[PDB]
Amino acid sequence: DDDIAALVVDNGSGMCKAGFAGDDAPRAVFPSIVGRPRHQGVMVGMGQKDSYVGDEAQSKRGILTLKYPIEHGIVTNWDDMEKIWHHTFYNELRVAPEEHPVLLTEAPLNPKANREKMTQIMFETFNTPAMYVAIQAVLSLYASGRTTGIVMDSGDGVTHTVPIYEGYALPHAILRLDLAGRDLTDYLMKILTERGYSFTTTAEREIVRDIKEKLCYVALDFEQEMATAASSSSLEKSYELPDGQVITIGNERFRCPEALFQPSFLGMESCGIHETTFNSIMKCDVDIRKDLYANTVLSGGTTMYPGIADRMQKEITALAPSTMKIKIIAPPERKYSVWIGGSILASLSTFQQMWISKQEYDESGPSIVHRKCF
């Protein structure tokens, strides 16, 4: 407590954040990538590792095959996650894992074996004293100052909407949808090939992601905006590539995020995000509908596109009943909020009963996490 602070480690699908509990800012945020060399190294004395992890891997993008250990919110390479956790504990923070508790976040709906494997890895090798698993979407509402409301989360893995009612996650009304930032980046490639610019390797995917981050916005009205873009060239902007070339994105700036609202562009038969949130509220009982319409919180990396707030408000107004209290509450720091909620939750004195001791794990195997943490 006083002597040692619990480690708050947020394992997002695209980025990984780490810091100490009770602190405002995470100490280290880095991409969750692992790269392996693809070319023969002929310089004898310059020093080449077998694999590069994190920011060191992203510095040398040209000579590596970048691989993501987390795929669609599901871990597909567990020793790769051992590497990313080793890099987090030893290099970024320079603290031993055996002397501090750790806090882990997770998707609202994950397989049981995934939780068991995380617990087994965290106790067996790192020998951490105490650990706890929390739902990613719950901690955002704690960071919001709220205990009742609907939380929409969208990262690089998957986009899900949950309702929370005085700290209770309703399991039936949690809805999932496969519209993440990675799919938007792939669609950005697919629409960039029209102008004449071709990107094909995993190195250029980071360039396309940076283009998506820096030059995109959400149209309030799609049909008017297409006519506006066809009429004039005032919407066009120029981006300057790492090799010195200059591209003109032009029309596609409001075509990249539009796959969120109309998933038929990507070939998916599912409904839009607004319909997903509307159906998520529709599945709950009547009594809590009024405080779900009157209380909506946006979170996640994808939700920082400019103009997403007004478009979201209009699209959820179009589906809501008449004279209904509708408001969207989007904090400016909405994709650092999960770490903030984790540090807040670890800061409390009544939270210290949540910790799982080493003796408890040694007695009850890796299956104790589900009984101890509901």
């Binding site: 009205d221 049909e223 008017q224 006519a227």
Partner: protein
């Protein structure tokens, strides 16, 4: 068919469905109408002759197409050829 049932014949599927639907709605008219009607008393009759004398789909096509629109909303996946694919037009140029 006396004491057996009802048969409707038609040139097309929609017309035959029209005829059989008119016949069955006639029979649940007649069954609950004729209950208190004893003989010529307690009855109102219409002369067939002077009442009969009184795109562009024919009889039953509107009928059967509306029922197919009802069925396709249940996920039946019928593939009936609709003259009009949607009730609303496509959105304008804006």
């Amino acid at each position: 068919l006396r004491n057996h049932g009802l048969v409707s014949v038609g040139e097309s599927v929609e017309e035959a469905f029209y005829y059989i639907h008119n016949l069955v709605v006639a029979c649940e008219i007649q069954v609950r109408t004729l209950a208190s009607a004893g003989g010529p008393d307690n009855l109102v009759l219409l002369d067939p002759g002077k009442y009969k004398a009184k795109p562009a789909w024919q009889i039953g096509e509107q009928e059967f197409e509306a029922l197919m629109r009802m069925l396709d909303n249940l996920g039946y996946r019928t593939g009936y050829p609709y003259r009009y694919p949607a009730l609303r037009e496509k959105s304008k140029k804006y």
